[PDB]
Amino acid sequence: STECSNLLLQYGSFCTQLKRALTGIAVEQDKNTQEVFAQVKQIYKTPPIK
Amino acid sequence: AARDLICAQKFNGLTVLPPLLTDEMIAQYTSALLAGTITSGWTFGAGAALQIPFAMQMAYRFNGIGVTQNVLYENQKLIANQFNSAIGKIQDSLSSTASALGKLQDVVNHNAQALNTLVKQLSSKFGAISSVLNDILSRLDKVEAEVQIDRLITGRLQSLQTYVTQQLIRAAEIRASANLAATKMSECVLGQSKRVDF
Amino acid sequence: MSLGAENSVAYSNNSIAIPTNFTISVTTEILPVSMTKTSVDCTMYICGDSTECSNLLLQYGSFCTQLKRALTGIAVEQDKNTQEVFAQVKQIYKTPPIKYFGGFNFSQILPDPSKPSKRSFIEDLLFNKVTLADAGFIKQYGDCLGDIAARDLICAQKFNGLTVLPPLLTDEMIAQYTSALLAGTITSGWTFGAGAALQIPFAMQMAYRFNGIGVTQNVLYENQKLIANQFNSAIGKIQDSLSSTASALGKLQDVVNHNAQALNTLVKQLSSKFGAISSVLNDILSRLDKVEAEVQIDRLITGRLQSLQTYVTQQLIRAAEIRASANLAATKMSECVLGQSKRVDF
Amino acid sequence: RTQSYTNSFTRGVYYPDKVFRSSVLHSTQDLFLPFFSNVTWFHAIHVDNPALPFNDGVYFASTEKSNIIRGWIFGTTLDSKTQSLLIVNNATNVVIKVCEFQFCNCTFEYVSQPFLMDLFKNLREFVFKNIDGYFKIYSKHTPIDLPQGFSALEPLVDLPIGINITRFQTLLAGAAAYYVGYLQPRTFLLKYNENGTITDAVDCALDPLSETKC
Amino acid sequence: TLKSFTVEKGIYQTSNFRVQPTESIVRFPNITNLCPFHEVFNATTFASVYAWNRKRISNCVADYSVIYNFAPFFAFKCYGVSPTKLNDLCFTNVYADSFVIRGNEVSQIAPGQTGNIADYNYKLPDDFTGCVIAWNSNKLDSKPSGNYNYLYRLFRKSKLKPFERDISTEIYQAGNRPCNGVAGPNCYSPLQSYGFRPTYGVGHQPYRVVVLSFELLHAPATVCGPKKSTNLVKNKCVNFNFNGLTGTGVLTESNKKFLPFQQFGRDIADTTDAVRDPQTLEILDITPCSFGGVSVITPGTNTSNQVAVLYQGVNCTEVPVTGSNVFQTRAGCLIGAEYVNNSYECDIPIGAGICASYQTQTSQSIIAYT
Ligand SMILES: *[C@@H]1O[C@H](CO)[C@@H](O[C@@H]2O[C@H](CO)[C@@H](O)[C@H](O)[C@H]2NC(C)=O)[C@H](O)[C@H]1NC(C)=O
Ligand SMILES: *[C@@H]1O[C@H](CO)[C@@H](O[C@@H]2O[C@H](CO)[C@@H](O)[C@H](O)[C@H]2NC(C)=O)[C@H](O)[C@H]1NC(C)=O
Ligand SMILES: *[C@@H]1O[C@H](CO)[C@@H](O)[C@H](O)[C@H]1NC(C)=O
Ligand SMILES: *[C@@H]1O[C@H](CO)[C@@H](O)[C@H](O)[C@H]1NC(C)=O
Ligand SMILES: *[C@@H]1O[C@H](CO)[C@@H](O)[C@H](O)[C@H]1NC(C)=O
Ligand SMILES: *[C@@H]1O[C@H](CO)[C@@H](O)[C@H](O)[C@H]1NC(C)=O
Ligand SMILES: *[C@@H]1O[C@H](CO)[C@@H](O)[C@H](O)[C@H]1NC(C)=O
Ligand SMILES: *[C@@H]1O[C@H](CO)[C@@H](O)[C@H](O)[C@H]1NC(C)=O
Ligand SMILES: *[C@@H]1O[C@H](CO)[C@@H](O)[C@H](O)[C@H]1NC(C)=O
Numbered sequence A: 001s002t003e004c005s006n007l008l009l010q011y012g013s014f015c016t017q018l019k020r021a022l023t024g025i026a027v028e029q030d031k032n033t034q035e036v037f038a039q040v041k042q043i044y045k046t047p048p049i050k
Numbered sequence B: 001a002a003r004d005l006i007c008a009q010k011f012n013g014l015t016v017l018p019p020l021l022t023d024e025m026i027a028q029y030t031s032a033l034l035a036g037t038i039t040s041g042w043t044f045g046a047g048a049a050l051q052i053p054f055a056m057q058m059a060y061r062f063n064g065i066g067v068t069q070n071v072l073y074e075n076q077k078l079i080a081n082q083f084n085s086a087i088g089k090i091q092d093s094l095s096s097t098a099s100a101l102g103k104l105q106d107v108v109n110h111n112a113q114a115l116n117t118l119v120k121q122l123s124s125k126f127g128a129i130s131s132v133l134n135d136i137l138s139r140l141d142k143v144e145a146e147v148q149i150d151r152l153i154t155g156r157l158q159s160l161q162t163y164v165t166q167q168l169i170r171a172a173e174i175r176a177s178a179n180l181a182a183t184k185m186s187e188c189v190l191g192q193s194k195r196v197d198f
Numbered sequence C: 001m002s003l004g005a006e007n008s009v010a011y012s013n014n015s016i017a018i019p020t021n022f023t024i025s026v027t028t029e030i031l032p033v034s035m036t037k038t039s040v041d042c043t044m045y046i047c048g049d050s051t052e053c054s055n056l057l058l059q060y061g062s063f064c065t066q067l068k069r070a071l072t073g074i075a076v077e078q079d080k081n082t083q084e085v086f087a088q089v090k091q092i093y094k095t096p097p098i099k100y101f102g103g104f105n106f107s108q109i110l111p112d113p114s115k116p117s118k119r120s121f122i123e124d125l126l127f128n129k130v131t132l133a134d135a136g137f138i139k140q141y142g143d144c145l146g147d148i149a150a151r152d153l154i155c156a157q158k159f160n161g162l163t164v165l166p167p168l169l170t171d172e173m174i175a176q177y178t179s180a181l182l183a184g185t186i187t188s189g190w191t192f193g194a195g196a197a198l199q200i201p202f203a204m205q206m207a208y209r210f211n212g213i214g215v216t217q218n219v220l221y222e223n224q225k226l227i228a229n230q231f232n233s234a235i236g237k238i239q240d241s242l243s244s245t246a247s248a249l250g251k252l253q254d255v256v257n258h259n260a261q262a263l264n265t266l267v268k269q270l271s272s273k274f275g276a277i278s279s280v281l282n283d284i285l286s287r288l289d290k291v292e293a294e295v296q297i298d299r300l301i302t303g304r305l306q307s308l309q310t311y312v313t314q315q316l317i318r319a320a321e322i323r324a325s326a327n328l329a330a331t332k333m334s335e336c337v338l339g340q341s342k343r344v345d346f
Numbered sequence D: 001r002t003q004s005y006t007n008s009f010t011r012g013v014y015y016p017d018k019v020f021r022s023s024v025l026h027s028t029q030d031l032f033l034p035f036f037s038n039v040t041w042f043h044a045i046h047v048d049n050p051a052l053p054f055n056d057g058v059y060f061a062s063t064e065k066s067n068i069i070r071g072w073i074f075g076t077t078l079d080s081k082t083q084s085l086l087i088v089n090n091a092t093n094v095v096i097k098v099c100e101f102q103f104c105n106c107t108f109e110y111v112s113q114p115f116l117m118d119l120f121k122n123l124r125e126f127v128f129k130n131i132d133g134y135f136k137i138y139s140k141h142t143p144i145d146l147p148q149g150f151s152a153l154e155p156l157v158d159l160p161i162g163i164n165i166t167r168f169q170t171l172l173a174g175a176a177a178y179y180v181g182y183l184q185p186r187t188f189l190l191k192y193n194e195n196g197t198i199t200d201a202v203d204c205a206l207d208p209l210s211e212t213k214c
Numbered sequence E: 001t002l003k004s005f006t007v008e009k010g011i012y013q014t015s016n017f018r019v020q021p022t023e024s025i026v027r028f029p030n031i032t033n034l035c036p037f038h039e040v041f042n043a044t045t046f047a048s049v050y051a052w053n054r055k056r057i058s059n060c061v062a063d064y065s066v067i068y069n070f071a072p073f074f075a076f077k078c079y080g081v082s083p084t085k086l087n088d089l090c091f092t093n094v095y096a097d098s099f100v101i102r103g104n105e106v107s108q109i110a111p112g113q114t115g116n117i118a119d120y121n122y123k124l125p126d127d128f129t130g131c132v133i134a135w136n137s138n139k140l141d142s143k144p145s146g147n148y149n150y151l152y153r154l155f156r157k158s159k160l161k162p163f164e165r166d167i168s169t170e171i172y173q174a175g176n177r178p179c180n181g182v183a184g185p186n187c188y189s190p191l192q193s194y195g196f197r198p199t200y201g202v203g204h205q206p207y208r209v210v211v212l213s214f215e216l217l218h219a220p221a222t223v224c225g226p227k228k229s230t231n232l233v234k235n236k237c238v239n240f241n242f243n244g245l246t247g248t249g250v251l252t253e254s255n256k257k258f259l260p261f262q263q264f265g266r267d268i269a270d271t272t273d274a275v276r277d278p279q280t281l282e283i284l285d286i287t288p289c290s291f292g293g294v295s296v297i298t299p300g301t302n303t304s305n306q307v308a309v310l311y312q313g314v315n316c317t318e319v320p321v322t323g324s325n326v327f328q329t330r331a332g333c334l335i336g337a338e339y340v341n342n343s344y345e346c347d348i349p350i351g352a353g354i355c356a357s358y359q360t361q362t363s364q365s366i367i368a369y370t
Helices: A002-011 A014-037 B005-010 B023-040 B054-065 B070-074 B076-096 B102-123 B133-139 B142-189 C042-047 C051-060 C063-086 C121-129 C153-158 C171-187 C202-213 C224-244 C252-271 C281-287 C290-337 D208-213 E103-108
Strands: C037-040 C162-165 D004-007 D025-032 D038-042 D058-062 D069-075 D086-089 D094-097 D109-112 D123-131 D134-142 D154-159 D167-172 D178-182 D184-192 D198-203 E010-015 E055-057 E094-102 E131-136 E206-213 E237-242 E245-253 E274-276 E283-287 E293-298 E308-312 E326-329 E332-335 E355-359 E365-369
Touching: A002 B142, A014 B023, A014 B142, A014 C290, B005 B102, B023 B142, B054 B070, B070 B076, B102 B142, B133 B142, B142 C290, C037 C063, C037 C290, C042 C051, C042 C063, C042 C290, C051 C281, C051 C290, C063 C171, C063 C290, C121 C171, C121 C224, C153 C162, C153 C252, C162 C252, C171 C290, C252 C290, C281 C290, C281 E245, D198 D208, E094 E103, E103 E206, E237 E274
Parallel strands: none
Antiparallel strands: C037 C162, D004 D038, D025 D184, D038 D178, D058 D123, D058 D178, D069 D086, D069 D167, D086 D094, D094 D109, D123 D134, D134 D154, D184 D198, E010 E293, E055 E094, E094 E206, E131 E206, E237 E245, E245 E283, E274 E283, E293 E308, E308 E332, E326 E332, E355 E365
16 A cells, blocks of 8 residues: 555654564574584484494 | 465465575484484594494493493393383384474464464554555545554554564574573583483 | 585494594684663653653653663673673782793783783784774763764764763773683682682693593693694684684674664654654644644654664663673683583583 | 767766755655666757657756857747746846747746856756746756766756746757756665765665665 | 652662753844735635636745734634744745635645545645635625626546646537537536525635645745844854744854755754854854763662762763762762772772772761772
8 A cells, every 4th residue: 555655654664673673583593503403514424234 | 265374474474484404404414413423422523533333332421421331241232122122112102192392383383373463463443443454545535544544554563563572582582492402412412411410 | 505525434343443643722702791781861862851742751651760770770780791701700810920831822812011901912803803882981972062074873872862881890800800810720720710729830730631631641741842832823823813804703793783773773763753744843842832732742752652662672682682691601701711621512 | 850879877866955964874755867777869950859748857968068058948838828938048147037938928037147157078967857836957067978977966046937847948049969868756875975965876776786775 | 769768779860960041042034024915815806716826925024913804714724833833933935825616615625635626626735734714705706696707617637736727728528529619519618607696505605715835944034923033142052043943052153064055954863953044144053952861879878868979971071060079980970979099899880990888087978999
């Protein structure tokens, strides 16, 4: 809606803060997965003899 | 014929981004950790991997916990059978009871219900005459519809800010749990732990 | 993305690998401890010396005492975080003038009396690497009151009731704590973390460390020069890495940038109209009668109160994260500087 | 006629208001000439149809060192029926008229300094905009085709004329060569220096890099 | 500030000190002419709504309290401003539009309206910042035989833009058959006259409408009010009224680079930084008066009532006028606690390595130390 978009632009700048917070959250979860699982430098493999 | 909630939240601007690491890469990471642990011991967490037979590795573990290594070499078959029976019991307990993964299921349920109530907040009037903008544009002139649009904008902005604050608190809790999991992986998979009940 | 290099360990039930040589390496760990302490006045921010806005703000409620209490608690929490991390030693120890610690150099980390602030070379590089903004009361109400051809953001946030409080401990006291901890660690070992400091030669202390990690002490006494040279080369590589690359301190730089951008957003939220006819209270009070200006002033009061509450909530969440990081740093100082740690990858 | 085409580069920047700003990155939404647009090059030779549509703002430029351009005529139609603007310059003073008497009962008259202050190449730039009944005239004199660089245009001349303008032509005293640019509502990112003038600008709807910059 | 009668030991931020203004100045341009609203309202006849007049008012002093004597209306209909506050502020250009419409059509002279007058005859912008004055005129605009001199348009191909005219008289062609002047069954003249009789009801009577448009802007002001000026004072916390804007601050001479067309400056928070004096063309910075924060260092109320007061961030040559001993600290100016050369444990924290305590000297007093 054009009128709602104009009034929301006239309102303030909360939405850039919300988008920045959500982007920081998503980058934080990617960092969490990387720092939990990627702890080994090389991919080892088991021998065929078990 | 029966629309799901996923299309209802996708049509309102609420999307879900995929993770950077797929499940195959996480499986490869866990397979590499398992191979290094069952082949080298704790030596792959300090420098390069140093090969050792598994009987000598378990003798190292028994010497770590305070038991002399002759106990293992005289009771190797019993300990191997007890470990195999323990893995079979883990298999049976995971096949029978599905309530062990309640933390992960609660994480999924919390995110789903947060998105569901964020969608359901769009059906509220917040003091205006209607909950839809098109009827406000069509029924009224510019001056009254500006007031009703301002009321709906204030209500939806408050709902979005409440959702963002709750997501921030939940993300802080998840980050603390991830730090605990990383510490457990560093101290218990890559080595032997002397801490009680860790 | 590639997860890593492919490897396959040659496993057999009668084959073992045992190292014949070692390598002494020095790494670096950077942890945030404290953050900027801010003080916010409601009457300067929301109203700015307007009597009608002040009367409607008093008529509104008592949210501002809650915001003031929250910001005060955050500031005292920052001071407590710094005191918990650094003040862990009872007495300010001192190194002897003779600096022969068994062949180890230790000159880049010990302080020098040439600088007025008793900081070492590595501490000087770390302090020069961070472009610190809003360090406290550095403006001191003199530069903002004067005439500047290009106004900065500091005076803009200063004139709107947004101030920054100085930390309780100066950098000289933090450097004195670090020098005392280093002096106790070199001259005593782990004995100064339990009771009184007991002196021991550094070669015998390093032999105690090797006995702690599971290596017999005859390895050190027959390879002391190689270990000293490896430590000196590692310290030189640390110096070169901290001189060349400028992206290592991106946690502290991110803390500074986050505080600066939060204050800048709080300043820039004052220009919004929030549905009113203007964003200036004086134009509203001049252009309208009592009732209409009361309506527009109430709308601007509600918008500015929402912005201030959003800022306070984000500051509370960031203060909780900084407190968790400070607790981790204090645990690392207690367990790894004051003793030898058996925890893997800690 | 000799119609040709030329890139616009970054020659369509003017001051959006009369408020002094220094060291401030400002975002404005107004009728602007887009960056790297298409201007029309005309070569008027008299021993040709000079009627051009207005379309919400006109950017005018000319590289002639000599004072051979006298002024412009505007209006919807030029059959001596509606009000048509007229600028007459004779290197001594400027003359502005509103009445329908064309080039050889007038409401508004304006006499001020001539628009040709300078007598190098002496590039002249003009922006004509008709918003809310005001004929905004922006001009800038640049001693240097269209070069690469920035030159902001100042609102030195304003007209409270309040008429309808659809067509426009020029006046000659032929080897004329002028460029015509068209304005579209765009969003810019103007940069003010320490002296308070506009030195750089970014068109937010050109490429995704400038959208990221905005 | 604690809502209690007993205060424990510590430091408390109580209030904020401010320097009050001393004088009040008003700066208005050197204009002595009088605006002719008399020629606008006191007129013999008006114009039609399709050919509405527009009178430019400029370079005069406007008194809006004399409007009520010229015409017998009820009240102003002002958008953006108030009718009683039109003398304490001033604009750049003021217009006046006169037309005669019907009583049902008065509501279409509002911003954002859609109808017959507000589409095809006279359209107001949605950002209107003026006043609409309308009154009944049934004795000068009505005849028993008929006043047919007032015309309005019913047919138009499109809608009018705000603040524009169309006085063309061409035959409207609604049908698909071209006529080019033949008033047949498909072509009609879009110009009809009101049949004004004195024997109507109150809704169909003629109404005279005068619309005032205001142009508050950063242009130099030409239409202002009856308020006298004041001599300019610098380097003093005063109250200023530069061309209708009210504020409190200290005005100093500038070394800025204002262009001849620019008359105001602004801040990132959209407040005024520099203002141009309307009488003499000079630029003055607006710097706010001295302020800060006040913190109170006290021991327990059961212990003593001695109080040391800290002014946060200022030096001691900037204090306006507590205690007697004055000490300089990097956190601010501390008044009421003497500085000792000893060093003890921190009792009450102050900042930058400075603490305060209540200790003896030989006679109890508050001391400050590193
Ligand atoms: C300990 O390290 C410092 C720093 O590298 C050494 O000081 C350097 O000494 C060389 C030769 O004397 C000079 O060329 C450098 O300019 C010195 N650098 C600095 C920063 O002073 C010092 O020599 C080392 N200690 C010992 C005993 O060799
Ligand atoms: C163990 O490694 C060290 C280096 O990490 C070796 O020391 C080097 O030996 C070579 C050959 O004699 C010299 O050229 C280098 O200058 C030595 N480097 C240092 C830092 O002293 C050492 O020889 C190795 N030991 C064994 C038994 O291989
Ligand atoms: C302008 O448009 C013409 C075609 O109408 C084209 O040939 C010419 O290259 C364009 N000018 C540019 C892109 O500078
Ligand atoms: C003068 O101009 C008006 C319109 O501005 C027009 O109606 C009138 O006919 C003109 N007078 C003459 C004599 O042409
Ligand atoms: C100008 O005249 C045209 C007809 O030539 C008309 O369509 C338009 O509405 C008028 N007004 C403008 C462009 O404001
Ligand atoms: C601003 O103007 C002064 C005055 O000549 C000049 O010295 C300075 O270089 C200008 N600033 C810039 C950024 O060009
Ligand atoms: C303009 O105002 C100044 C103020 O002192 C006055 O001296 C001057 O005479 C005025 N100019 C005119 C033309 O009245
Ligand atoms: C308006 O003013 C005139 C003076 O020009 C006066 O003669 C007349 O009576 C007044 N009233 C009306 C209704 O015209
Ligand atoms: C305070 O004023 C004194 C006297 O002018 C001055 O020397 C000093 O630099 C100022 N600032 C501080 C922080 O003391």
